Amino acid sequence: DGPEKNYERTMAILQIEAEKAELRLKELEVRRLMRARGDGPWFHYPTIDKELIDHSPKATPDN
């Protein structure tokens, strides 16, 4: 292969690897925030479903 093909093949390799590296650093930062704040789709630990509640008038009034 000539130097030009290897040179520009290297640039294509570097671009992919640089893009993956930035995404890897971004994922770690995103995970740290989500786990700290709980405001994301990850680390979403379930709470009790409120459709289970019965809203009918009960046997007694105060409830």
């Binding site: 992919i16 993956k20 405001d39 994301g40 789709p41 979403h44």
Partner: protein
Amino acid sequence: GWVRPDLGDLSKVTKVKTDRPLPENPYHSRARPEPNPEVEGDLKPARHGSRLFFWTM
């Protein structure tokens, strides 16, 4: 003139006229916490794959 109600009458659910306004917040609930932002948009393939160490897919 009193007529004894028949079997089953006193267990009916009835409707009553009232001027007392319907209570707005009978449980005295605080304002509910805001839900988390929805995730929306089209699902696209992961950029450069799993990106797990050396794997290219």
